[PDB]
Structure 1
Amino acid sequence: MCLKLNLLDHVFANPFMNAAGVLCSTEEDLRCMTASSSGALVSKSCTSAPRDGNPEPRYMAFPLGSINSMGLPNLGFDFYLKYASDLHDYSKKPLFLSISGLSVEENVAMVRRLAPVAQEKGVLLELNLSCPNVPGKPQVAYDFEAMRTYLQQVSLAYGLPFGVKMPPYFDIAHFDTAAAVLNEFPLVKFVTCVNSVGNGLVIDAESESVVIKPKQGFGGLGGKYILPTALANVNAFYRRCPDKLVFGCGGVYSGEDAFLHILAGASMVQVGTALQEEGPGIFTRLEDELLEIMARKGYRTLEEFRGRVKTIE
């Protein structure tokens, strides 16, 4: 029985990795992810210049999940490019680099300079499209014309396979439109579903207060709250993008949750909230748990059940 995968011309010991943003901002965090049992890691979404992000408290977690308005704190692109080019040990596992420029021009600037490193060292680009653009307009992936522009400019600038990180959608017409846009771009080889569920609001009953400071307490939701949403999106894109991979992200706490993602169509399975809460030991647990469900069911490999969710009648 084995959790091995070979995709995007890389070899992965297992499907598990962190979710962008969690345990991946500093060198220390990237070394820790690298030392862990995960099959891959992704670096924190970056911008051209370093950012401090939003005022604290800006992340809080609870039994059913988490809320955040981090505001894209990061060490700047040159840092993550240097980690990719000079520091990462690719003999340990593959690296994804996430970018999240605040305009199309910022993303173009970064991917231009990432290209040669991607070509030489094999770092894989994850472009975050659940990201602000002009304030007062929707985030990039909820503005299909902007999404198209972004993908056109980055495809031209970068010129190598990449993937995209998507927000969740909630309407079939949006699933249809979004996948149609993605399918215009042959270089988009993977689609990671999903980013956080936007603009949730957690309120503490005792203090009568919101729990994060930015944005009057509104923030993106992760964890147990979002698993059926995540699954839906994974499957919706898996069905609509047959020439792309789908990576699943949202609500993974256990090997059972990872199994569901994989039955929905996931190749890699990313872990955000649960990893934030439990720490990198989670990856040995998830591995063990997923192998046990496979043993019970008689599955020897991931391909035997990936995307094989049954429907009724």
Structure 2
Amino acid sequence: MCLKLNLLDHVFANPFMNAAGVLCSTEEDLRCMTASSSGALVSKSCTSAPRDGNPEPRYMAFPLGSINSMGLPNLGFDFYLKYASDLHDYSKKPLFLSISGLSVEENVAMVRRLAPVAQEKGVLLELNLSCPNVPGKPQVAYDFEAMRTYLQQVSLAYGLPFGVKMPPYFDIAHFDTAAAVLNEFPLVKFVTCVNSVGNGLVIDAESESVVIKPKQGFGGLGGKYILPTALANVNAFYRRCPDKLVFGCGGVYSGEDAFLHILAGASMVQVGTALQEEGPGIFTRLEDELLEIMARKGYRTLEEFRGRVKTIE
């Protein structure tokens, strides 16, 4: 029994990968993820130019998860494109490249250059829609008209199958609206649910202080805090986007947690906080734990249970 699967005209050894932003910013990171047992890797969300990001401390982890306000530190698009074009070993696993420009024009500029490399090498685009918006408006994916514009412009500029990374939603009307927007775009072939739970606040009782420096301690939450949110979003989009794949991200620390994401509808399962905390050895543990649960239940394939969460009555 093995976890190999085929999606987006690629073969994957298993459904696990890193979450964008974790262990994927530098060439060293990308080589380390490539050497791991993960089924795929994604690169850090990039801008056209390099960014130093926010002042430190900008990430912290705790027993129940993590908080971050990184400020999108990254080596710039030219680096990531070079990695995709010249450095990645596609014989080891597929590569996703994440883009998060500060405007629609920057995204369009980047995707027009990516497209030929996508054709040549098969790198897959993940568009991060938790990017900033015009003044006074929330992140792009929380502004449905902006999201529709970004996707129209990217679809036109890129012209190839791509995916989107979504923030969590918390309201059923919002699930309906967001999914309806995505379903306007046939090139959007996967939806990754979810980015961090925005603008939480961790306070240390001893020091009476916040634990990250940017944004007066506010930052995105990941880890155990966010698993039921993540599952909800995976399933909501699984149900609403039948012609797309859903990738799960949020709260995965174990093969049990991965199993839940796949029950909810996930094709690939992304690992953020737990990977940051445990390191790339986590992939072997997650694979073994997932196969152990499958074996106990009599499942031989992921397809036997993906999306098959039961409802009551």
Q: What TM-score, normalized to structure 1?
A: 1.00
Structure 1 SS opposite 2:163: strand
Q: What does residue 301 of structure 1 align with?
A: 301
Partner Cα distance (1:290, 1:135) in 2? 45
Give the drift of 1:90: 0.1
Q: Count residues in correspondence.
A: 313
Q: How does 1:7-156 map to 2 (within 5 A)?
A: 7-156=7-156
Partner Cα distance (1:289, 1:136) in 2? 45
Give the drift of 1:4: 1.0
Partner Cα distance (1:181, 1:129) in 2? 13
Give the drift of 1:2: 2.1
Cα-to-partner distance string for 1:249-307 (whole Å, 9 max, x where unaligned): 00000000000000000000000000000000000000000000000000001000000
Give the drift of 1:123: 0.1
Q: Determine what percentage of the aligned residue pairs are the same residue.
A: 100
Give the drift of 1:133: 1.5
Which segments of 5 or more consecutive residues in structure 1 lack a partner in the other structure? none
Q: What does residue 243 of structure 1 align with?
A: 243
Partner Cα distance (1:137, 1:66) in 2? 26
Partner Cα distance (2:85, 2:104) in 1? 24
Cα-to-partner distance string for 1:185-212 (whole Å, 9 max, x where unaligned): 0000000000000000000000000000
Give the drift of 1:135: 4.0
Structure 2 SS opposite 1:44: coil
Give the drift of 1:131: 1.7
Which segments of 5 or more consecutive residues in structure 2 lack a partner in the other structure? none
Partner Cα distance (2:237, 2:114) in 1? 27
Partner Cα distance (1:141, 1:249) in 2? 16
Cα-to-partner distance string for 1:63-87 (whole Å, 9 max, x where unaligned): 0000000000000000000000000
Q: What TM-score, normalized to structure 2?
A: 1.00
Cα-to-partner distance string for 1:132-159 (whole Å, 9 max, x where unaligned): 1224310000000000000000000000
Give the drift of 1:130: 1.2
Partner Cα distance (1:194, 1:39) in 2? 19
Partner Cα distance (2:101, 2:108) in 1? 9
Cα-to-partner distance string for 1:217-254 (whole Å, 9 max, x where unaligned): 00000000000000000000000000000000000000
- 4+ runs deviating over 6 angstroms: none
Partner Cα distance (2:183, 2:114) in 1? 23
Give the drift of 1:9: 0.1
Q: Aligned Cα RMSD in Å?
A: 0.4
Structure 2 SS opposite 1:310: coil
Partner Cα distance (1:296, 1:250) in 2? 24
Partner Cα distance (1:89, 1:301) in 2? 27
Partner Cα distance (2:309, 2:130) in 1? 27
